[PDB]
Design a protein around this ligand. Structure first.
Ligand SMILES: NC(=O)c1ccc(OCC2CC2)cc1
Lengths: 198, 194
């Protein structure tokens, strides 16, 4: 069930694949990033091939596609992180139990940005000791979403009289979304790792 | 890929099925409980049929069987909870975000007698206590400690290859803690009284 464009892994479960500039795959990610980070320079873009994370994520997507019926449940978003976090995210994905309190909090979960410029802030993509910054391009199952609130440990219910039927994620603003928060494992697949510098 | 002992769900994805007293499945689950809790009165046992939770759980079980290079990754454990949390656990399973002296995960007991304490299975206004029988992917485990947010690494020369769960005592475990969604499937709900 692994995507057929992935490199052969020789029955290995995990692989990072360096992309070539001028390939459509590299160029689409570069254009998405430079739309709002034209003042930074990309060192490299690696495709993340993680069989187990992919499998769990694709099971969740199919469940949300069945439950929501005729919705675009997936967006491509950005996530800046520190170099210390990269090994863990590459193997295990995004753990809400490890998430920082955001400067504007819409709930206790993992935060993903619409614009690379948000994730490019030193507060999220902290420069390592060689001055490299790290940002993931992430498939996120945002599904049906509402404006979040600082107290949330799960998405709120759609209906107060049915407390277990939940929104899929929350946002800062439903009309003009700039960030999404997710509260469950395997709701986000880290697809690419951008390494960049001033 | 829904198990054989489940009953038909008329094309729905979630239902709670009351077990018939005196039949094989009811007798099997009652005996697990009464091993340590024979002084308690059983009102009913329900089979939890949650297609989505089962699917996600089965994927994690297949992945752990590959990673550990053997079966024997699954244990049947108990979880006592309050009446107000029962609809959430039936629909969404166990959530670490909702005493945590062996880590910030979900706690499961080897013995029903431990989960039957009023501190976990809080009596509701009518005296009814609630306990799940849970399939748990305990896998390879180590001793836990306060403040863990994931299990420790097997070798701190490879800090991303983790233990699957933690316990109070590795030689004679009486409880297990898991730190990831869909590492536990709530299989039966026992309603009982002191
Ligand atoms: N909810 C439960 O059934 C349960 C709760 C706690 C527990 O271990 C607590 C540990 C001694 C500190 C096991 C099970």
């Amino acid at each position: 069930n692994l995507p057929e464009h992935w490199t052969d892994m020789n029955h290995q479960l995990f692989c990072m694949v360096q992309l070539e500039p001028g390939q459509s795959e590299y160029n689409t990610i570069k254009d998405k990033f430079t739309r709002t980070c034209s003042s930074y320079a990309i060192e490299k873009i690696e495709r993340i091939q993680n069989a187990f994370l992919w499998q769990s994520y694709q099971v969740k997507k199919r469940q949300m596609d069945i439950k929501n019926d005729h919705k675009n449940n997936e967006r491509l978003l950005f996530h800046g992180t520190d170099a210390d976090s990269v090994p863990y995210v590459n193997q295990h994905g995004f753990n809400r139990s490890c998430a920082g309190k955001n400067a504007v909090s819409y709930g206790k979960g993992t935060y993903f940005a619409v614009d690379a410029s948000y994730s490019a802030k030193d507060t999220y993509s902290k420069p390592d000791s060689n001055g490299r910054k790290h940002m993931y391009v992430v498939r996120v199952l945002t599904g049906v979403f509402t404006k979040g609130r600082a107290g949330l440990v799960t998405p709120p219910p759609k209906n107060p009289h049915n407390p277990t039927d939940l929104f899929d994620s929350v946002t800062n603003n439903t009309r003009s979304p700039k960030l999404f928060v997710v509260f469950f494992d395997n709701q986000a697949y880290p697809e690419y790792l951008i390494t960049f510098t001033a």
